[PDB]
Design a protein around this ligand. Structure first.
Ligand SMILES: C[C@H](CO)OC[C@@H](C)OC[C@@H](C)OC[C@@H](C)OC[C@@H](C)OC[C@H](C)OC[C@@H](C)O
Ligand SMILES: O=c1ccn([C@@H]2O[C@H](COP(=O)(O)OP(=O)(O)O)[C@@H](O)[C@H]2O)c(=O)[nH]1
Length: 435
């Protein structure tokens, strides 16, 4: 009877976190309208068990479409990076359709992502309470917000240093992007929901709450648990905790030079590895052999397996043969790895990833391969950390911390959603009176 419409950003990681949050709300007797573009809805539907179909319904949001930018491209999943400005612009142009959806479905609440300032504005115009749900962690946000208030002060609560490669990478344009992101958090009604847990980020959540003067409510970690037959057969031939899964997420394509450093690091380590290699949608002129160093797979032999396009990440991470994760440190991948007790070898690429890698290093559940002074990935770093964490297991402290973190995360049940449910109930009761 109480209805919530959820509007994630058009990225697969965002959709996935929103879907897990929808399931938690469905278990609390809420009816959910899950709204996204058709290509995103098609990608996420196989991850919703049929038992949830009655409670969780998918609603198609239409973006402007053209032969140059057709609906199969209305996602960041595999999108050429140069189309990201168009995708953001097209999403802002879906506001009129979103208003029509809200008028037709009249949901009691809207949960929106941090990439859409228009969404709380449409909701306010229709007198629908709106709450911001952030699918990422809080460490990077608190780090980004701290210099605004304290320009001459070190970030407290952490010894993390951002490498110059990221510190270096239109000024007015960057400021506007940050203002739009912060507005989504600031505009939220009463509370901000965050995909995080206090044991990992409690101090940072509290600091963010003070800076924004807004209550921050953790609802994490939100981890989904479900070509695998072939992969499992190969993993079954390996020793326990001997293989590393290599993945850079659904939105990033490493350059040839980056792939060269990763490949040589894997080769030098002598580890078993499963590596997902992807090419942007529309690129039928590119191939695995082209993107990888000459003879690398032939040298690896039985030790190496390359998976084209997409892999069952959760199932691989849960396999007894998996001992490490070479990851770009996307938040969903970090949370999954922590839940499954797999140590992370960090190869962050951009946006929040460097911060996530630093948090993983600070927790002690993983290690970060450092970039060189010119900002390049180093094959020697990758080889050294794989050798220490998976092949020789000289870093027993990291393996122990990863197991302890997994034990903590596995111990949490539906109680983690109690604070969000109580805040939703209070907000709806207050708004009921006002309108
Ligand atoms: O919304 C307004 C925004 C656009 O500009 C705010 C700006 C004044 O700075 C915010 C912060 C740094 O406060 C410091 C400000 C001088 O005062 C610092 C302290 C004495 O309260
Ligand atoms: O081959 C792949 C690559 C990624 N994922 C899933 O894609 C999501 C990636 O989210 P993340 O936040 O880690 O990074 P992003 O793709 O947003 O950069 C995670 O749930 C991964 O488990 C997967 O299932 N198979």
């Amino acid at each position: 009877t109480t209805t919530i419409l959820m509007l994630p950003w058009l990225g697969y990681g965002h959709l996935s976190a929103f879907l897990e949050l929808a399931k938690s709300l469905s278990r609390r007797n809420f009816h959910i309208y899950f709204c996204s573009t058709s290509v995103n809805l098609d990608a996420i539907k196989p991850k919703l068990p049929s038992s949830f179909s009655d409670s969780i319904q998918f609603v198609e949001l239409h973006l402007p479409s053209s032969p140059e930018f057709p609906p199969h491209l209305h996602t960041t999943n595999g999108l050429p990076p140069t189309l990201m400005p168009a995708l953001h612009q097209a999403f802002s142009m879906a506001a009129q359709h979103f208003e029509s959806i809200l008028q037709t479905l009249a949901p009691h609440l809207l949960i929106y992502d941090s990439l859409q300032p228009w969404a709380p504005r449409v909701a306010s115009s229709l007198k629908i309470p709106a709450i911001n749900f952030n699918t990422t962690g809080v460490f990077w946000i608190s780090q980004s917000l701290h210099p605004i208030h304290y320009p001459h002060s070190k970030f407290p609560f952490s010894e993390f240093v951002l490498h110059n490669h990221w510190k270096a990478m239109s000024t007015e344009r960057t400021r506007k992007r940050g203002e739009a992101f912060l507005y989504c958090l600031h505009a939220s009604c009463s509370v901000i929901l965050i995909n995080s847990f206090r044991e990992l980020e409690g101090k940072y959540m509290d600091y963010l709450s003070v800076l924004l003067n807004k209550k921050v409510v953790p609802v994490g970690p939100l981890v989904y648990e479900p070509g695998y037959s072939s992969i499992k057969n190969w993993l079954d031939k390996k020793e326990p905790s001997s293989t590393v899964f290599v993945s850079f997420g659904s939105e990033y394509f490493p350059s040839k030079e980056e792939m060269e450093e990763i490949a040589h690091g894997l080769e030098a380590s002598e580890v078993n590895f499963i590596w997902v290699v992807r090419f942007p949608q529309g690129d039928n002129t590119s191939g695995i052999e082209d993107a990888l160093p000459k003879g690398f797979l032939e040298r690896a032999g039985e030790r190496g397996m390359v998976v084209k396009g997409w892999a069952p990440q959760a199932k691989i991470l849960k396999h007894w043969s998996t001992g490490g994760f070479v990851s770009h440190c996307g938040w969903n991948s970090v949370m999954e790895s922590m839940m499954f007790g797999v140590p992370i070898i960090g190869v962050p690429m951009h946006v929040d990833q460097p911060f996530n890698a630093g948090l993983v290093e600070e927790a002690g559940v993983g290690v970060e391969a450092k970039r060189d002074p010119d900002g390049k990935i180093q094959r020697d770093e990758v080889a050294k950390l794989i050798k220490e964490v998976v092949v020789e297991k000289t870093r027993e402290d990291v393996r122990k911390k990863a197991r302890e973190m997994s034990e903590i995360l596995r111990s949490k049940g539906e109680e983690k959603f109690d604070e969000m449910v109580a805040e939703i109930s209070l907000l709806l009761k207050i708004e009921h009176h006002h309108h």
